[PDB]
Write a protein that binds this ligand. Structure first.
Ligand SMILES: CCCCCCCCCCCCCCCCCC(=O)OC[C@H](COP(=O)([O-])OCC(O)COP(=O)([O-])OC[C@@H](COC(=O)CCCCCCCCCCCCCCCCC)OC(=O)CCCCCCCCCCCCCCCCC)OC(=O)CCCCCCCCCCCCCCCCC
Ligand SMILES: CCCCCCCCCCCCCCCCCC(=O)OC[C@H](COP(=O)([O-])OCC(O)COP(=O)([O-])OC[C@@H](COC(=O)CCCCCCCCCCCCCCCCC)OC(=O)CCCCCCCCCCCCCCCCC)OC(=O)CCCCCCCCCCCCCCCCC
Ligand SMILES: CCCCCCCCCCCCCCCCCC(=O)OC[C@H](COP(=O)([O-])OCC(O)COP(=O)([O-])OC[C@@H](COC(=O)CCCCCCCCCCCCCCCCC)OC(=O)CCCCCCCCCCCCCCCCC)OC(=O)CCCCCCCCCCCCCCCCC
Ligand SMILES: CCCCCCCCCCCCCCCCCC(=O)OC[C@H](COP(=O)([O-])OCC(O)COP(=O)([O-])OC[C@@H](COC(=O)CCCCCCCCCCCCCCCCC)OC(=O)CCCCCCCCCCCCCCCCC)OC(=O)CCCCCCCCCCCCCCCCC
Ligand SMILES: CCCCCCCCCCCCCCCCC[C@@H](O)O[C@H](CO[C@H](O)CCCCCCCCCCCCCCC)COP(=O)(O)OCC[N+](C)(C)C
Ligand SMILES: CCCCCCCCCCCCCCCCC[C@@H](O)O[C@H](CO[C@H](O)CCCCCCCCCCCCCCC)COP(=O)(O)OCC[N+](C)(C)C
Ligand SMILES: CCCCCCCC/C=C\CCCCCCCC(=O)OC[C@H](COP(=O)(O)OCCN)OC(=O)CCCCCCC/C=C\CCCCCCCC
Ligand SMILES: CCCCCCCC/C=C\CCCCCCCC(=O)O[C@H](COC(=O)CCCCCCC/C=C/CCCCCCCC)COP(=O)(O)OCCN
Lengths: 140, 55, 53, 104, 459, 347, 122, 56, 69
């Protein structure tokens, strides 16, 4: 639940890349499990082996994306000596996007995923820096 | 190359393709209650733990 | 939303059954009549936000 | 029927000059067309174009250009006789300005 | 200011209570009289604006835009009554109602004191335009064009709304006078960068800026004649007016956020001007010349100098008049041969001598021949750009060379050479078309003698 | 069905909704929901036609499941505090259960699947009632317990409803499924602002109700339930298609129409609470609704589709029964923006 | 959240409290009332259009009733709206008065003493 | 004979009177913004012995 | 032209003064209302945001068949 997010967030950015990558891999695996559950519910896989294969495929894809994103973002934040910079998250974003393109075996998806995941990750970094609120507590 | 192909490809054609794909994915439910009541069960379970187990 | 016709007309359609400290048959008290009476009295009219604290 | 529907043939365009050789191209009715021409010409060329241009040409000097020229002449005359600089580097007086405490 | 609005609103019941054969006469006469009344707003002050009331005000930037807007309605009515002959009475009145509603929305848009009211009217101008394009356009592409027109604009302006109600929550007001007097610098932060983008991209799409200009060659080409006239002459200038109005809050953030847009404008000027050289559709060539001309207005507004603002105002007015005239000139040939291909009807100077003179004058103003106000605005923007950076003269110079090339090419293809042999239905010019050209061109030339009337609040 | 029986079933549906709306005791609110459902089931089956039976069965199963979770939440709240009054819901597990039950009743995503099927399976009058009157009771309950509502869950379901309604509407040729997906999107808009301001929720509900009533009455007037059937109406009653086009443009949310007022009023509210990303995503997502409204407008009013020969006979007859509130509903759904400040009368 | 739903002393379904009588009533020539009447006139025109009757002159009694009903409802709607805004202003002023330490009166410097950064445009 | 002209040409006075009415509505507006009439530091002036307001 | 169609600069000048005063006051009031709403919502000590509690007049203060209530 919330624990997986704070496990990633508690590690400082450009440090301990192994632990940051493990946390991102766990987050990705959870996301892939949720996607697999909904996909199996709304589109039955015609047998148990096919359901297991589809679930493993989706979960491995998501976990691989998370691992690559975390590893490259931490490494970039540590070699450039510039943590708190959204460019590291953009580079991680196309790390994950190119991973997705490789997993689905298509160049167009890979390039689109570079662009969109990198932009989204850089935006998330900007929101962390500036305190943007996705869900805002009512105050007025 | 630019005006008729790539400028079309990046802004409007990409948007139309993505929305069409998402619409097809969303609307292609056969109408069997056995599938989306199981979906309801998954949704209820997630809510209890993801949003409920941290208040 | 909530249209308070009971308050407007003084009708009492269901308020007799909301709390356990409200006029039971044969004056049988709830297990926690004193506690709920004290809590209700303390929080009366100060609003929900104030009462909680 | 190898046609998909019942449809009118596409009609050929009408030449306004066939029935009104001096047609002005405003309407099929000759009288209405002629009055459309007269009204467009009078209210466009005689009223808005000529009278409007005349009105704009003689607009009063609310932009205060002649006023500014007169004021500038007055101050140039006054300053030159005085021997004071023609123009001042600072628009706002230094006495009314409170700079921060010290340069460091 | 209601002395212009209310007479414009009375054009609706007057149109609906007119005889079946009198709607065009009544609408033309009374829209011309409204233009005459609108001429009184040109009496501007040198220090502040004409603050009519809490809601409406007029400045030296919005007054020429208002005059052009009111002047364009009679020309649109004259240009529309030929191809709407076979139309039923109620649909003719509906078309005229669309035009009147468009004028009303534009008039209120140019004079609104508060930015949210300006936004609401500037977005309301979409409905009549889309209805005009998708109901009275001639071809099957007009539907797609409409969608392109609708969603390019809205995708730009939906963030703008979110920005505006955000600003009022922090500064307390959206009144433009208060916004200008109580102005504060924009800090250099990611939140301010995205607020800057939300305040600017809506106007950039309307100009349009090279890269998000795709909707324009569709919408202008597929629209009926009055639709394309109003799209080119007034609706493109909404972005320029809004950018000029909203730039005050933007500083000092604009100095570095303007670079991508300046690069896009200074290169897309060349790109669209060169696109005009290989264009088989005449109306499409005229449409692309508009993008090439508005790139210059974008550059002038981004560099933020008094000479650039004066030049941008002058160029917006001059382009409105010239592009409207060119669209009408192409429509005259289209209503003869029923094709927009430029090489289909040639040698027309032999068959239509005076319309050839109209073509020549329109082409001369399009390539900014001195001392036309096209040239005044262009040269002011070029001088300000030279001050911004000398290297700009290379790009600016190149654009001028290209603009003259596709203008005269457009003239040589359609007017010179020998007339195609098969065509035999080329009738002599009507008085309506000749007067429509004259009422475009005479005000343009007359504005040369009093250019301060179109140079904006920085004069 | 007998007209007296129909009348008394309609009165029972309305009485259940009003019982929910005037009750201070949770048990009476539950009873109002039960009474509403009991009389609601036969109204959906008024014309037998087995698709109506299917829609009634699906609706019954969904609403009975929601009622059970609602009762369980009431009992959990009572267990953790001997309270029956509808208030800020002292227990958070009970609050989550209650929010999920009410989201199932309203049809918010992801509990949204039933709305398109039930709406397609019933008649247009039944669809009108289902998409207008049935939303009042759950939203009136949510307004009361809004202070204890968890924003993260409610806003997640609101964004999901907006996205899913917009995406689902794009694929539809049937008019009732289009109306259902529009309803899902507007429910998401209603529930996004609920934790911040219930007056905005009420305002959006009222504007959506008048727009939905106008649209459903215009579809009843021209007996069209498909896009191609609606494309014949220009050749029989052009005025109806013109008013339909303006109502569709208003439903799209384009200014200066009435549809724009709620979104404009919700975004502003969310900006006073430092919510910027959420309104921007919602406003950009509403463009999908606008697209599939514009496509219907293209089909019915802005172009003329081919007609049939027998339509000529229909030229000789008039619409017999008239809907008296249709003109008022159309004017209210289009030309009401200048009176926006009157929303202060809703608080 | 409901800002004024539970304001003390509020009568549940009143629509027009007695204290609202202390406010000036809207004038019968109020531009908002004229817009309500215009809405009624448009409703009458659309009624004639749908019923396939002469739009402008079909039923003058019906058009008059449309206009009159819209104006009559709008008058009371305007009264309630004005009263509700007056209540908001009254409460906000009273709360500012009763919480001085939360709205401290600040002595204001003049522009001669404030140091604003200058950003040249070049 | 007057009806033969008026009954088909009265739409010709809608925009003229709509102009006149518009001017009137401007003047009334000017009557709601008089809080500083003859009160500005630049134009404050002693009234002429007969005049009542510096502007309308 | 000036005598027939226009007014002196003072009319526009002082109308601008009045308009600016009204707009500045409205902006100040908007900011003050936002601050009052924030404080009232958090504290619960104002007329606004008053959430209902149990009415005290519902309690039965009678002997309860058992001495300890
Ligand atoms: C407070 C609120 C909370 C409330 C909830 C709390 C719960 C507390 C109590 C829990 C105890 C439960 C007690 C009784 C429950 C009743 C279960 C029941 O009735 O089953 C009916 C249901 C339908 O029965 P059926 O129609 O007669 O049989 C059809 C064949 O099974 C199908 O024939 P086939 O050969 O064509 O298909 C093979 C089979 C093979 O199934 C699969 O393909 C799925 C394989 C997934 C691999 C992992 O099925 C399918 O392919 C279709 C998909 C259905 C699979 C089950 C869906 C579960 C949720 C979806 C997520 C799955 C996990 C993905 C990863 C997520 C993280 C774990 O049975 C099943 O779906 C499978 C057995 C379920 C038993 C486990 C229940 C737990
Ligand atoms: C108004 C504004 C104006 C702007 C608007 C217009 C311009 C914007 C739009 C135009 C550009 C957008 C296109 C982007 C990629 C689209 C690919 C695609 O459509 O896939 C579907 C399409 C269908 O795939 P399929 O049908 O499923 O598979 C069958 C294959 O078609 C058949 O298979 P195949 O055997 O024939 O070929 C496949 C294979 C075999 O490849 C080949 O056959 C031939 C070689 C192709 C790649 C060669 C690249 C190496 C050399 C290029 C170096 C840079 C350029 C020179 C710079 C000079 C510097 C002074 O290709 C590869 O293995 C290449 C893998 C990746 C290597 C290239 C990626 C390097 C990234 C560059 C980093 C830059 C960082 C900043 C640098 C700063 C300093 C400049 O895939 C392709 O066929 C195209 C693949 C080639 C993609 C690389 C070409 C683009 C290079 C630049 C991309 C940057 C643009 C986007 C910016 C934002 C992204 C972060
Ligand atoms: C925040 C402030 C604002 C709040 C806003 C509130 C919400 C606003 C509105 C929300 C949305 C409303 C949507 C309405 C949907 C209705 C569905 C429908 O009727 O079909 C459409 C219908 C379709 O017509 P059609 O298909 O052409 O006709 C063919 C027939 O259906 C063919 O059928 P047939 O051949 O069977 O024909 C039979 C026909 C002909 O009728 C007859 O022949 C009459 C026969 C008389 C039989 C008498 C039987 C008596 C015995 C039964 C007793 C039952 C007791 C139940 C109570 C038990 C309590 C424990 O009867 C009917 O058509 C329907 C009759 C309707 C009866 C209404 C019953 C009202 C019950 C009230 C409940 C509340 C009571 C208090 C409860 C307190 C708590 C406990 O046309 C329309 O209704 C158009 C839309 C009308 C909407 C009205 C506009 C909204 C309201 C505007 C007025 C002002 C409202 C605000 C008032 C403010 C307070 C003063
Ligand atoms: C800030 C704005 C300020 C002002 C607001 C202005 C906006 C409009 C006004 C407000 C809304 C008005 C609604 C009521 C009108 C509805 C009636 C109608 O349908 O018209 C037909 C009717 C013609 O019928 P007829 O003459 O009896 O006989 C011919 C047959 O009916 C033959 O008829 P038919 O049915 O056989 O013809 C077939 C035709 C039939 O189709 C139609 O009739 C279309 C009706 C439009 C529906 C309106 C929707 C509701 C209003 C929403 C407007 C949204 C405003 C936002 C801007 C976006 C604009 C779309 O279908 C088509 O042609 C298909 C074309 C599809 C195109 C799609 C565009 C449609 C929507 C555009 C609406 C624009 C305004 C409409 C102007 C009035 C007409 O038109 C009229 O005669 C009435 C028009 C207005 C009456 C004026 C009377 C006043 C007298 C002067 C008093 C002087 C005052 C000062 C006193 C002091 C003086 C000294
Ligand atoms: C000497 C010869 C050369 C001189 C040429 C000069 C040309 C100047 C006039 C030409 C047209 C003028 C342009 C119209 C702008 C006026 C609009 C408005 O600003 O004027 C209003 C004034 O309204 C007037 O009525 C102006 C209306 C004039 C309309 C001109 C229409 C002429 C066309 C005739 C058509 C022919 C009929 C059909 C024949 C077939 C202002 O309201 P008002 O409150 O007062 O002013 C406040 C200042 N006060 C306090 C001093 C009064
Ligand atoms: C085709 C027509 C489309 C319209 C064109 C619109 C153009 C929009 C471009 C926006 C202009 C600038 C945006 C932000 C300013 C700088 C961006 C960045 O490149 O510069 C560095 C930013 O640092 C890093 O590079 C972070 C950005 C990297 C992640 C963003 C991905 C950008 C890739 C291009 C995406 C394509 C844009 C259009 C999308 C459709 C500056 O270094 P730094 O000192 O650290 O940051 C200072 C900024 N502060 C003050 C706010 C803190
Ligand atoms: C995350 C959610 C993203 C939501 C963003 C929505 C973007 C707004 C555009 C939505 C339009 C979707 C239209 C669409 O996809 O339809 C596909 C459609 C299928 O055909 P039909 O319309 O069904 O009818 C004919 C076939 N029988 O294909 C088409 O014909 C497309 C024609 C319309 C294209 C016009 C789109 C122009 C958009 C330009 C760029 C702006 C897009 C909006 C987002 C901009 C970036 C923030
Ligand atoms: C035809 C295509 C045109 C495309 C136009 C779309 C681009 C518009 C620009 C971004 C729109 C959203 C901006 C939000 C409005 C700004 C208001 C604001 O200032 O809020 C910011 C917050 O800013 C944001 O959250 C914006 C982040 C982005 C959210 C949505 C992502 C949209 C995509 C971003 C990149 C695209 C923009 C450029 C694309 C150009 C068009 C191709 C700060 O507020 P606070 O939270 O209170 O911070 C101070 C106290 N903490």
């Amino acid at each position: 639940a919330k624990t997986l997010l704070h496990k990633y967030s508690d590690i400082p950015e450009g440090t301990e890349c192994h632990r940051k990558a493990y946390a991102s891999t766990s987050i990705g695996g959870a996301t892939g499990l949720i996607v697999s559950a909904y996909s199996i519910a709304l589109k039955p896989p015609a047998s148990f082996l096919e359901g297991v294969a589809r679930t493993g495929r989706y979960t491995f894809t998501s976990a691989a994306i998370g691992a690559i994103f975390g590893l490259t973002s931490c490494i970039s934040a540590q070699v450039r000596e510039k943590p708190d910079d959204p460019l590291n998250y953009f580079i991680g974003g196309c790390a994950g996007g190119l991973t997705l393109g490789a997993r689905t075996r298509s160049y167009g998806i890979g390039a689109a995923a570079c662009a969109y995941m990198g932009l989204t990750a850089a935006l998330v970094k900007m929101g962390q820096l500036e305190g943007w609120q996705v869900f805002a507590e009512p105050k007025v | 190359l630019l005006d008729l192909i790539w400028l079309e490809t990046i802004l409007p054609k990409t948007t139309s393709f993505i929305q069409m794909k998402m619409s097809i994915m969303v609307s292609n439910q056969k109408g069997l209650i056995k599938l989306y009541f199981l979906s309801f069960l998954i949704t209820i379970m997630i809510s209890m733990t993801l949003f409920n187990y941290h208040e | 939303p909530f249209f308070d016709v009971q308050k407007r007309l003084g009708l009492d359609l269901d308020r007799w059954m909301t709390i356990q400290s409200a006029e039971q048959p044969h004056k049988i008290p709830g297990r926690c009549h004193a506690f709920e009476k004290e809590w209700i009295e303390c929080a009366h009219g100060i609003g929900g936000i104030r009462a909680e604290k | 029927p190898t046609i998909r529907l019942q449809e009118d043939p596409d009609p050929e365009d009408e030449n306004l000059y066939e029935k009104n050789p001096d047609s002005h191209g405003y309407d099929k009715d000759p009288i209405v067309d002629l009055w459309n021409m007269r009204v467009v010409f009078f209210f466009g060329f005689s009223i808005v174009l000529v009278l409007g241009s005349t009105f704009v040409a003689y607009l009063p000097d609310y932009r205060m250009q002649e006023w500014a020229r007169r004021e500038a002449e007055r101050l140039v005359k006054y300053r030159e006789a005085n021997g004071l600089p023609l123009m001042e580097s600072n628009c706002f007086d230094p006495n009314k300005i409170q700079l921060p405490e010290d340069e460091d | 200011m209601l002395k212009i609005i209310i007479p414009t609103t009375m054009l609706l019941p007057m149109t609906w209570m007119s005889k079946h054969n009198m709607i065009w006469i009544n609408a033309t006469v009374h829209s011309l009289l409204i233009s005459l009344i609108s001429l009184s707003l040109l009496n501007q002050l040198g220090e502040n604006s004409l603050n009519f009331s809490l809601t409406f005000f007029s400045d030296s930037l919005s007054a020429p835009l208002l005059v052009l807007t009111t002047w364009l309605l009679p020309l649109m009515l004259m240009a529309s009554q030929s191809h709407l002959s076979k139309e039923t009475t109620t649909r003719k009145k509906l078309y005229i109602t669309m035009l009147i509603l468009l004028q009303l929305f534009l008039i209120m848009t140019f004079t609104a004191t508060e930015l949210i009211l300006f936004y609401i009217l500037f977005e309301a101008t979409l409905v009549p335009t889309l209805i005009i394009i998708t109901r009275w356009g001639n071809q099957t592409e007009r539907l797609n064009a409409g969608l392109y027109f609708l969603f390019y604009t809205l995708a730009g302006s939906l963030p703008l709304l979110v920005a505006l109600v955000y600003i009022q929550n922090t500064t307390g007001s959206l009144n433009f006078l208060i916004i200008h007097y109580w102005s504060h610098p924009l800090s250099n932060s990611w939140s301010n960068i995205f607020m800057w983008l939300a305040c600017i991209m809506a106007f950039m799409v309307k100009m349009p800026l090279y890269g998000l200009h795709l909707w324009l060659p569709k919408a202008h080409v597929e629209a009926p004649i009055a639709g394309s006239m109003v799209l080119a002459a007034v609706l493109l200038k909404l972005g320029g007016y809004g950018m000029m109005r909203i730039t005050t809050i933007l500083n000092p953030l604009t100095n570095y956020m303007a670079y991508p847009f300046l690069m896009l404008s200074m290169w897309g000027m060349i790109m669209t001007s060169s696109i005009c050289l290989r264009q088989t559709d005449l109306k499409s060539l005229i449409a692309y010349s508009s993008v090439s001309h508005m790139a210059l207005v974008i550059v002038a507004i981004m560099i933020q100098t008094p000479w650039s603002f004066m030049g941008a105002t002058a160029l917006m007015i001059a382009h409105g008049l010239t592009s409207s005239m060119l669209f009408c000139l192409a429509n005259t040939n289209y209503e003869r041969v029923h094709s927009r291909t430029m090489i289909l009807a040639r040698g027309l100077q032999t068959l239509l001598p005076l319309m050839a003179t109209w073509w020549l004058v329109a082409s001369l103003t399009n390539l900014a021949l001195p001392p036309s106000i096209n040239l005044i605005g262009e040269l002011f923007i070029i001088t300000a750009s030279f001050s911004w950076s000398n290297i700009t003269i290379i790009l600016m110079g190149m654009n001028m060379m290209i603009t003259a090339l596709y203008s005269l090419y457009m003239l040589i293809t359609t007017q010179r050479g020998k007339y195609t042999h098969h065509i035999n239905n080329i009738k002599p010019s009507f008085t309506r078309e000749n007067a429509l050209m004259a009422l475009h061109i005479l005000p343009l030339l007359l504005l040369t003698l009093n250019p301060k009337m179109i140079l904006g609040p920085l004069y | 069905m007998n007209p007296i029986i129909y009348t008394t079933l309609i009165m029972t549906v309305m009485s259940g909704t009003m019982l929910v709306m005037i009750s201070s005791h949770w048990l009476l609110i539950w009873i109002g929901f039960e009474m509403n459902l009991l009389a609601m089931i036969p109204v959906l089956m008024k014309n037998f036609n087995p698709r109506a039976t299917e829609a009634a069965t699906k609706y019954f199963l969904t609403q009975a499941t929601a009622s059970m979770m609602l009762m369980m939440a009431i009992i959990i709240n009572l267990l953790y505090s001997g309270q029956w009054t509808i208030t800020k819901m002292f227990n958070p597990v009970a609050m989550t259960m209650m929010t999920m039950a009410l989201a199932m009743k309203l049809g918010l995503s992801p509990f949204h699947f039933w709305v398109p099927e039930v709406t397609q399976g019933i008649s247009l009058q039944a669809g009108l009632l289902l998409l207008t009157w049935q939303k009042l009771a759950p939203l009136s309950v949510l307004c009361q317990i809004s202070q204890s509502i968890n924003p993260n869950l409610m806003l997640t379901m609101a964004m999901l409803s907006i996205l899913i309604g917009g995406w689902g509407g794009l694929n539809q040729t049937q008019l009732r499924k289009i109306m259902a997906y529009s309803s899902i999107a507007h429910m998401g808009w209603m529930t996004a602002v609920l934790p911040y301001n219930t007056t905005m929720t009420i305002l959006n509900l009222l504007i959506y109700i008048t727009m939905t009533l106008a649209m459903f009455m215009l579809l009843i007037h021209s007996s069209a339930t498909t896009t191609l059937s609606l494309s014949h109406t220009w050749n029989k009653m052009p005025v109806i298609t013109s008013l339909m086009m303006v109502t569709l443009l208003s439903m799209g949310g384009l200014p200066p129409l009435s549809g724009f007022m709620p979104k404009w009023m919700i975004i502003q509210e969310m900006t006073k609470n430092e919510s910027i990303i959420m309104p921007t995503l919602m406003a950009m997502t509403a463009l999908l609704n606008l697209y599939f409204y514009m496509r219907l407008a293209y089909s019915s009013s802005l172009t003329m589709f081919p007609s049939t020969n027998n339509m000529k006979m229909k030229w000789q007859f008039e619409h017999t029964k008239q809907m008296k509130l249709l003109p008022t509903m159309i004017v209210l759904s289009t030309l009401v923006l200048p009176m926006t400040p009157a929303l202060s009368s809703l608080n | 959240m409901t800002m004024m739903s539970g304001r003390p002393g509020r009568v549940p379904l009143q629509f027009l409290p007695n204290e609202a009588r202390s406010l000036p009533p809207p004038k019968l020539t109020d531009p908002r009332l004229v817009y309500m009447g215009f809405l009624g006139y448009c409703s009458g025109l659309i009624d004639n259009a749908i019923r396939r009757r002469p739009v402008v002159s079909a039923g003058l009694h019906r058009q008059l009733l449309y206009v009159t009903s819209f104006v009559f409802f709008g008058y009371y709607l305007l009264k309630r709206q004005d009263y509700m805004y007056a209540l908001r202003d009254h409460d906000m002023f009273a709360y500012v008065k009763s919480h001085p330490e939360d709205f401290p009166e600040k002595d204001k410097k003049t522009y001669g003493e404030i140091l604003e950064e200058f950003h040249p445009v070049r | 004979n007057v009806l033969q002209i008026v009954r088909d040409h009265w739409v010709h006075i809608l925009v003229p009177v709509g102009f006149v009415f518009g001017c009137y509505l401007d003047r009334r507006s000017d009557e709601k913004l008089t809080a500083f009439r003859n009160k500005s530091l630049l134009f404050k002036r002693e009234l002429r012995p007969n005049e009542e307001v510096t502007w309308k | 032209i000036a005598r027939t169609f226009y007014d002196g600069p003072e009319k526009n000048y002082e109308k601008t003064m009045a308009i600016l005063q009204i707009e500045a006051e409205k902006a100040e009031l908007r900011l003050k209302e936002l601050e009052v709403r924030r404080l009232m919502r958090a504290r619960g000590d104002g007329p606004w945001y008053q959430y209902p509690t149990i009415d005290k007049a519902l309690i039965d203060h009678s002997p309860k068949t058992t001495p300890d209530n």
